[PDB]
Design a protein around this motif. Structure first.
Motif, PDB file in Angstrom:
ATOM      1  N   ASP A   1     109.916  83.414 -26.833  1.00 52.42           N
ATOM      2  CA  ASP A   1     109.894  84.101 -25.681  1.00 52.42           C
ATOM      3  C   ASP A   1     108.180  84.538 -25.562  1.00 52.42           C
ATOM      4  N   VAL A   2     107.794  84.746 -24.402  1.00 51.80           N
ATOM      5  CA  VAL A   2     106.343  85.396 -24.120  1.00 51.80           C
ATOM      6  C   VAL A   2     106.389  86.403 -23.170  1.00 51.80           C
ATOM      7  N   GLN A   3     105.726  87.295 -23.067  1.00 47.39           N
ATOM      8  CA  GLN A   3     105.554  88.365 -22.446  1.00 47.39           C
ATOM      9  C   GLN A   3     103.810  88.553 -21.854  1.00 47.39           C
ATOM     10  N   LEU A   4     103.725  88.711 -20.635  1.00 46.97           N
ATOM     11  CA  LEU A   4     102.242  88.766 -19.842  1.00 46.97           C
ATOM     12  C   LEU A   4     101.087  89.329 -20.769  1.00 46.97           C
ATOM     13  N   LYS A   5     101.465  90.181 -21.859  1.00 46.69           N
ATOM     14  CA  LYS A   5     100.263  90.876 -22.487  1.00 46.69           C
ATOM     15  C   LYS A   5     100.068  89.906 -23.764  1.00 46.69           C
ATOM     16  N   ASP A   6     100.920  89.043 -24.182  1.00 45.74           N
ATOM     17  CA  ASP A   6     100.702  88.105 -25.372  1.00 45.74           C
ATOM     18  C   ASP A   6     100.306  86.514 -25.102  1.00 45.74           C
ATOM     19  N   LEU A   7     100.239  86.237 -23.854  1.00 47.60           N
ATOM     20  CA  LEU A   7     100.188  85.005 -23.214  1.00 47.60           C
ATOM     21  C   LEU A   7      98.741  84.422 -23.568  1.00 47.60           C
ATOM     22  N   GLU A   8      97.665  85.457 -23.497  1.00 47.62           N
ATOM     23  CA  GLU A   8      96.257  85.395 -24.070  1.00 47.62           C
ATOM     24  C   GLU A   8      96.122  84.755 -25.325  1.00 47.62           C
ATOM     25  N   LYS A   9      96.947  84.860 -26.337  1.00 46.14           N
ATOM     26  CA  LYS A   9      96.977  84.616 -27.725  1.00 46.14           C
ATOM     27  C   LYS A   9      97.397  82.897 -27.800  1.00 46.14           C
ATOM     28  N   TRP A  10      98.163  82.650 -27.139  1.00 44.00           N
ATOM     29  CA  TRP A  10      99.039  81.291 -26.918  1.00 44.00           C
ATOM     30  C   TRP A  10      97.826  80.383 -26.162  1.00 44.00           C
ATOM     31  N   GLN A  11      97.274  80.797 -25.107  1.00 43.88           N
ATOM     32  CA  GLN A  11      96.239  79.749 -24.601  1.00 43.88           C
ATOM     33  C   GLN A  11      95.017  79.634 -25.411  1.00 43.88           C
ATOM     34  N   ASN A  12      94.684  80.831 -26.395  1.00 41.62           N
ATOM     35  CA  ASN A  12      93.500  80.768 -27.185  1.00 41.62           C
ATOM     36  C   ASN A  12      93.867  79.759 -28.268  1.00 41.62           C
ATOM     37  N   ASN A  13      94.976  79.584 -28.582  1.00 33.50           N
ATOM     38  CA  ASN A  13      95.273  78.711 -29.752  1.00 33.50           C
ATOM     39  C   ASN A  13      95.577  77.301 -29.557  1.00 33.50           C
TER      40      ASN A  13
END
Lengths: 129, 190, 84, 83, 150
Positions: free
Chosen positions: A79-91
RNA sequence: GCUGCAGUUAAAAAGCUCGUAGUUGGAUCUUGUGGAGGGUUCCCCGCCCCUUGCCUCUCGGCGCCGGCCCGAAGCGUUUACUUUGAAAAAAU
């Protein structure tokens, strides 16, 4: 045994692209595979495609244009929430200028840039660039 | 009695009473008197086709349709002879039930049969139109705009019974379902 | 295979060569045939990979013998396939 | 590459393989540029006009350049879509 | 691959795309049901009825002439057996090996193959007990096994 | 070493096979035209077949010259997920 069908579909495309082949055959077909292919096609990374009926889940033939660097899957559908999506696209992405994460959401299967306009979170399926 | 078509309040229409008169008067001559028995036709319509001409659709109830198809090869040839240069098709009176999960009322006391699904009805309507011939296989093409086309393969025997009606089959299936279809013959078949 | 052969249109000699489960769409190699014998002449139907020792309606001792592949006929007058 | 003023900022734009749609690098010394003469339709004679292709070194060393040059010459008018 | 062997062979049937009955077939749905009911009185299992019908008559798939699978056709007339036919065959093979081992106690291969048969009985019975085909108190026993198949 | 390591030869795959708990598990069951904001088709209304899926009361205001209409309620098969409200000492 075959625990997941979407991982076969993308690994089969990825090996055919690296050999320089102009077409590939995907089997078994699924509702999830047809919706994932459509997101790559709409952004311009693959050509058009055709489905064969055989009375046993079906098959797809896809046309390749040489633009695709990679496509892939994240196996646990976290699961992903809008606040944590930045960390996934950085990875997962090669630059801030191009490439896409694909999410499944209650508004549909979609591009991670559309999920911000629609103000929605979801589960991760895969990526392409 | 005459005017057999449609439920109460809908019945008096000139075109549909006209086609059902033209059906029920045909039992009066000695040949079709052997095999018609005032069997129900539920509705009929007259509809435009791509050449700027017209065609008719006849609606048959499911437990009667297995008897209609056994005589359709003569019964439609007589109707296509009698009408003013028209093309004819018989199709089933299938019902669709809505999706139980969050798109209908639902409860344990009755379950939606899979025979009443939208997919099982739309892919059965495709078999009724082609009846003198048999479906050999299907393919589906997805275009760069995101649209779909269906390609249907018809058996190579009985070409003479359907090649002049593929242009009405596409227009009828479009108006029954909202989808584009092409009808084609195979290179070879096993 | 070259770099560019299209997968949607195999020729019938490319399709007839490969295994029944590995064709583009599946199809059996077996068939139905109608069979006839001397002395009594009521025609009968047989399957080409039969496991049964078939006896005809003409009551002859054997119409065909079973085998590890196709069954073998007892010199009967027909081996003709049915078309469909 | 362009900036927000719309002007271009690359040193040069590199060529791509006609068979394969991948960039040919500055040190790919196995790669080639092919050039082929056109002929006039009344008398089969050279008019000075020509057509060109570029082939990746990786496709050459696996043996696929002959069939790639043939497909390109059938896609253009030269081999006339019969064989 | 096979569940108790290193083999991974591919042999199986392959049905055609066309589900229809062929125009040459003279039989009809209720006459096919009567032939099934006559063959069941001889003690033939469903698996044997389908080969007699395929080899000696025109019907390639009974399910395409008659809209039902042939074990349902037997259950709706009360002709079906009280133990499922694949579980019956595994139990018959276990008692054949047990009659061998009483006089041949040096045959250590036969001792090993009996473990692989009876563990395949336990896996199949556990499936049928959850789908209410067998009582919850049903149990295979090495002393009782001979009485299940006589 | 979850992100993120390693096990032919440098340290390291149980001699071999079965098996209960644990972890993991194939395909399938409703869509395109019209209008607003925005584009040149898709996100909100209303529709091929259902649009809150049904329903008809009665204690209880509305619309009009009793009767017929439109907001509660029975509730939509049960949960995870996600988005939003409420409510959580100060100092740091």
């Amino acid at each position: 045994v075959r625990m997941n069908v979407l991982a076969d579909a993308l690994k089969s495309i990825n090996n055919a692209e690296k050999r320089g082949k102009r077409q590939v055959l995907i089997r078994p077909c699924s509702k999830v595979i047809v919706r994932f292919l459509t997101v790559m096609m709409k952004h311009g990374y693959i050509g058009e495609f055709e489905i064969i009926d055989d009375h046993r889940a079906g098959k797809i033939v896809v046309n390749l244009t040489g633009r695709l660097n990679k496509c892939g899957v994240i196996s646990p559908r976290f699961d992903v929430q809008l606040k944590d999506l930045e960390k996934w696209q950085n990875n997962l992405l090669p630059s801030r200028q191009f490439g896409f994460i694909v999410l499944t959401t209650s508004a549909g299967i979609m591009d991670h840039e559309e999920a911000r306009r629609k103000h929605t979170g979801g589960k991760i399926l895969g990526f392409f660039f | 009695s005459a005017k057999i078509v449609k439920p109460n309040g809908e019945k008096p229409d000139e075109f549909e009473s006209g086609i059902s008169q033209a059906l029920l008067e045909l039992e009066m001559n000695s040949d079709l008197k052997a095999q018609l028995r005032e069997l129900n036709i539920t509705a009929a319509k007259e509809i435009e086709v791509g050449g700027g001409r017209k065609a008719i659709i006849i609606f048959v109830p499911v437990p009667q349709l297995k008897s209609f198809q056994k005589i359709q090869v003569r019964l439609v040839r007589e109707l296509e002879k009698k009408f003013s240069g028209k093309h004819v098709v018989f199709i089933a009176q299938r019902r669709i039930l809505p999706k139980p999960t969050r798109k209908s009322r639902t409860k344990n006391k009755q379950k939606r049969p899979r025979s009443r699904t939208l997919t099982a009805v739309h892919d059965a309507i495709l078999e009724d139109l082609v009846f003198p011939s048999e479906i050999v296989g299907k393919r589906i093409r997805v275009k760069l705009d995101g649209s779909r086309l269906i390609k249907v393969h018809l058996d190579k025997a009985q070409q003479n019974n359907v090649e002049h009606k593929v242009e009405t089959f596409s227009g009828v299936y479009k108006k029954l379902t909202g989808k584009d279809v092409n009808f084609e013959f195979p290179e070879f078949q096993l | 295979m070259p770099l560019a052969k299209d997968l949607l249109h195999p020729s019938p000699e490319e399709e007839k060569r490969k295994h029944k489960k590995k064709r583009l769409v599946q199809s059996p190699n077996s068939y139905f045939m109608d069979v006839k014998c001397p002395g009594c002449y009521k025609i009968t139907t047989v399957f080409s990979h039969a496991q049964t020792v078939v006896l005809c309606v003409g009551c002859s001792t054997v119409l065909c013998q079973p085998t590890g592949g196709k069954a073998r006929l007892t010199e009967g007058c027909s081996f003709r396939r049915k078309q469909h | 590459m362009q900036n927000d003023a719309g002007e271009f900022v690359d040193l040069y734009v590199p060529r791509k393989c006609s068979a394969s749609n991948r960039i040919i690098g500055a040190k790919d010394h196995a790669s080639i540029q092919m050039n082929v003469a056109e002929v006039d339709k009344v008398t089969g004679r050279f008019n000075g006009q020509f057509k060109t292709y570029a082939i990746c070194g990786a496709i050459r060393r696996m043996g696929e350049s002959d069939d790639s040059i043939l497909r390109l010459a059938k896609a253009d008018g030269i081999v006339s879509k019969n064989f | 691959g096979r569940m108790h062997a290193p083999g991974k062979g591919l042999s199986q049937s392959a049905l055609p795309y066309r589900r229809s009955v062929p125009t040459w077939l003279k039989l009809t749905s209720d006459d096919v049901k009567e032939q099934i009911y006559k063959l069941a009185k001889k003690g033939l299992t469903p698996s044997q009825i389908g080969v007699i019908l395929r080899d000696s008559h025109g019907v390639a798939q009974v399910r395409f002439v008659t809209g039902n699978k042939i074990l349902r056709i037997l259950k709706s007339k009360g002709l079906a057996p009280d133990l499922p036919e694949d579980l019956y065959h595994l139990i018959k093979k276990a008692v054949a090996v047990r009659k061998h081992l009483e006089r041949n106690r040096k045959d250590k291969d036969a001792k090993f193959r009996l473990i692989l048969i009876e563990s395949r009985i336990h896996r199949l019975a556990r499936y049928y007990k959850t789908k209410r085909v067998l009582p919850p108190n049903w149990k295979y026993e090495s002393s009782t096994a001979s009485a299940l198949v006589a």
